[PDB]
Amino acid sequence: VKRTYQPNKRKHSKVHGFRKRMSTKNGRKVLARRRRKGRKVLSA
Amino acid sequence: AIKKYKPITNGRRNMTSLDFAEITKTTPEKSLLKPLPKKAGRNNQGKLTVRHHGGGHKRQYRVIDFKRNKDGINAKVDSIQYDPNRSANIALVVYADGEKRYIIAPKGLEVGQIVESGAEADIKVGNALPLQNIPVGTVVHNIELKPGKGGQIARSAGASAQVLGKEGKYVLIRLRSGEVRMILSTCRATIGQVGNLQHELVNVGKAGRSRWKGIRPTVRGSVMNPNDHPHGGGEGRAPIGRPSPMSPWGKPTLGKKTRRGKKSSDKLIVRGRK
Amino acid sequence: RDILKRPVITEKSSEAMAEDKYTFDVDTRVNKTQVKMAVEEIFNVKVASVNIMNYKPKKKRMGRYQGYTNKRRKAIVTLKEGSIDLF
RNA sequence: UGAUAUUGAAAUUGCUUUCUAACCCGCACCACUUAUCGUGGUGGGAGACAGUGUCAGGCGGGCAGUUUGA
RNA sequence: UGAGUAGCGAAAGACGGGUGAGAAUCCCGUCCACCGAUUGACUAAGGUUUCCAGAGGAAGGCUCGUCCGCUCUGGGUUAGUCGGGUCCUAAGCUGAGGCCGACAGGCGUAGGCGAUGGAUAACAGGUUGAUAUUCCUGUACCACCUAUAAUCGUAUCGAUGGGGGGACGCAGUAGGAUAGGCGAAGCGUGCGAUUGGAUUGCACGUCUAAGCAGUAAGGCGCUGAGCUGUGAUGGGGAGAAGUUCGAGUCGUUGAUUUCACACUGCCGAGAAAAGCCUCUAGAUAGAAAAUAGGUGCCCGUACCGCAAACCGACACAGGUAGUCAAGAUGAGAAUUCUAAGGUGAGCGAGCGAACUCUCGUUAAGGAACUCGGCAAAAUGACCCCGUAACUUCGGGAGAAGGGGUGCUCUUUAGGGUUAACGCCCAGAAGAGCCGCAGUGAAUAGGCCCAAGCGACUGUUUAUCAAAAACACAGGUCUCUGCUAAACCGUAAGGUGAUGUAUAGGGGCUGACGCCUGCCCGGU
RNA sequence: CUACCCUUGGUCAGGUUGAAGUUCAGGACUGAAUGGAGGACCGAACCGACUUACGUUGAAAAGUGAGCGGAUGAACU
């Protein structure tokens, strides 16, 4: 059987990375919200 | 013409194919091609706007000139060739002073031809001249609309239009479809007819040979669910069940006109299609 | 210059080829040309060649507490004439 | 689909018809510029129409919110 | 509690000798067994120290454990040439000005980023517990700099520009060489104990890049070309013998590898840009012949990688791209047995109950069973003969239905290569021998007669429906004159289409053959 | 992951048949050579998932055994 998560460093950082988050208004809201909570690890 | 096939299997049974005794060459001139990436009816939003496209075979865009704008600098039709992205066959004309171009090869040409600005060339197949010079009764193809952009009308395979009477501002034209309409007197047009007349005679035979020209299958609205097509569901095979067959987006798809009511070119049409 | 940190001495692969080559843990942001220059400037020799290898940080986790070691450049210089002392 | 603003001139009688500067050109060339973007300039075409704004009428299960008694 | 209960995750282990406080399990050895188009060698993604050595046995390991992918303590990754960057560009993304948009923001030109592709200089051997075109040994090639340079000066340097070239589909053959394989000459080791024999039994039969030549074929005397031959190489490796000595031959066969997307054919008409070669705009003023010396940065490099290290909660019968792929048998990468090489499955010992699962045989009968011949039996390969109705002339069809096959020995044509002998592939026919059975095992179509549906190949409900459903090639109606209609977005902007009525969108029907009747109230 | 598309790559042991076309002998058409066509045939990898048994507090939140279908293409990747 083929499961849903096939890991890929490039895919993971190109979709959920930091720079992809910072290159948007909404991603910046997400980063601000995670800094507000106190997350040890902001982005993926 | 066209060549048939013995029915050595199912699938090539009632299948015919165009017989390329007209294509006199098997390679394009290198410098007149460009890449041509496919788009399965996807717009710049990435969405599927126009259906039943996608797939097929790679192409190379032969840069054809529909301008045909020179000083009567003569040409010699060297090669007739295949164009994978228009129904006509193309013709690789060389000008008298070193230039290569692709004409829509009309029917019956290996001679040598002249773009005709004024009363320069003659009315013989392959000459492109204004509509003010072309006498009445000629069958021209590759007619411009706006003076100097490249001809747009009468451009498919085996297509041609008649030059009916004129006025000095707008020569009439009877298009291939029965449309009779006026065209500005300084818009070029090529004498003759566009060759490759067998193009409508060919049975593509099998469902795969249709699928490698870029045509995905077309489902019928009547075998779709109610949220997809107005022809909707129903138990068993159901009829249209409406007072009018509708298109997939909810417009009456049979008999209703979509021709705009305020266009600038309604003083240019004398009669409509019939 | 002081772009050399710590003379690596190990069981075999810092002594069993030590008569001719010397290994130094070096600063983690330096070419192997700066290392050549630094060794020629400190030990006063003439260097034939130099190799460099980065290591990962390995997670020595002792006492209910996680954590990584440091990363490090391991340079290995091959002398042409002369020798290095202190060991 | 109408009235109206952008919206001008002339004839003839508000319906009509002609013109050019408004407006428009997924027209041609030129310059920014060793860019099918754009801007500007020059011709052409169209021309007070189209497009756009406010107002009104009609069509409109394409879509929506709902009712469908005991 | 259920209860000392179900389970303990596919598979062959045995004994000896150890270590030990303690051994079915840990180590070493011998035998045996399993894979072997793979359970073997190598690599991309992924993981991220699981790699190695010394020590340990609390917890983990489905039992045990003295062991370990677990714990503790020290170690391990080496590049001018390998993969990526300092080179190029598809798709896509981003986008100075710009266009649009309540705001946010969207689209987009020049530009830039972006390999899965294009270009690009290094090979063979040796070594440790852990690296290996990286370290070392030998022999190289490429870019740049410094001192000479032979010979200089329209000599040279050229574009951020013009041109060429790069540069490309698919299929089918025939061919050239070579990798590999196989058999006999030199080799070296043995020459037995069970009857026998020494024309005996084994295992070996090598070697690169680069540079000098020449070279099947290929396209237009030029360009490019696998392979060969000389050195490279007194070297390195080498079955073995006593640090040193040690052979390296023929004949055959031959790819799916390379010449080579070559050549022919075909139609569905098959990337781009750079490096590269040139051209003059423009620079105007060195040496590329040669002599040596110097210079060459960043990133990955450990280990797993059909898996106990990845994705599946697990030391999980599942999933995971490409790469090399030996012998006997054969069409063959099928089948059976082995090679190189690697594993024996992380609970066992008894006894051989009912019952359940997997498997084998069975008297007479032969579908009588049953929703139904479901399941299982049977056919099954190669050669020869023979083969109906019907038909769209293609087919049906491997129709159906029969017969043959093992070994030995005689005699005769044969194919290839070949001085010749010699090998390899092949047969004929006939005389014999054996058996219950001769493609003696494994692998390998059940067939026919009718009927309903759908013409056909295809597609479909990931996980209760694979069909008569969908698609279809063909038919027909209808809208669309090009800023086309239709569609997405509020708009800019796009697709349609770099297309243009032999074209484009939409509705119905569904190959082919014969046809497709009537009514316009209403809507 | 799954559906569809786009751009650049890769894989499909072996065998069977024998269309057009051409070449020859005749006399438009015949026969023999050649040719190698096909959503052709058989059949491994590969990709599926028809039947059926087993499993169902499973080895596995969809699998295993035996058979079964496509296997040059509307292929798989």
- Could you give all domains of chain B from N- to C-terminal order, each with its CATH number? 1-111 (2.40.50.140), 115-194 (no CATH), 195-274 (4.10.950.10)
Instruction: State the chains in contact with A (3 or more Cβ–Cβ pairs under 8 Å).
Output: none
Decide if B180 contacts B172 (C-beta within 8 A): yes
Helix (H, G, I), strand (E, B) or coil at B77: strand
Amino acid at B255: G
Helix (H, G, I), strand (E, B) or coil at B102: strand
Instruction: Please measure the distance between the N-terminal and C-terminal CA atoms of chain A and give it in whole angstroms.
Output: 27
Q: State the pairing for strand pair B188-191/B180-184.
A: unpaired
Q: DSSP letters along B190-220, please?
A: EES-BS-GGGGS----STTTTTTSS------
CATH number, domain containing residue C37: 3.30.70.330
Q: How far is the CA of B101 from the C1' of E192 (A)?
A: 91
CA-CA distance, B188 to B103, in Å (whole number)? 14
User: Solved how?
Assistant: cryo-EM
CA-CA distance, B222 to B235, in Å (whole number)? 11
Torsion angle defined by CA atoms of residues B55, B58, B63 and B66, in that order, rounded to the nearest 10 degrees: -30
CA-CA distance, B196 to B154, in Å (whole number)? 14
Fold topology of A1-44: Helix Hairpins (1.10.287)
CA-CA distance, B158 to C41, in Å (whole number)? 86
Phi–psi pair at C21, nearest 5 degrees: -125, 140
> Which nucleotides in chain E lie closer than 7 A to a protein CB?
45-49, 51, 72-79, 90-93, 104-105, 107-108, 128-130, 134-136, 163-165, 167, 266-272, 295-301, 310-312, 318-320, 392-394, 455-457, 469-474, 477-483, 485-489, 493-503, 505-512, 523
CA-CA distance, B151 to B161, in Å (whole number)? 12
H-assigned helices in B221-270: none
The domain ranges of chain A are 1-44
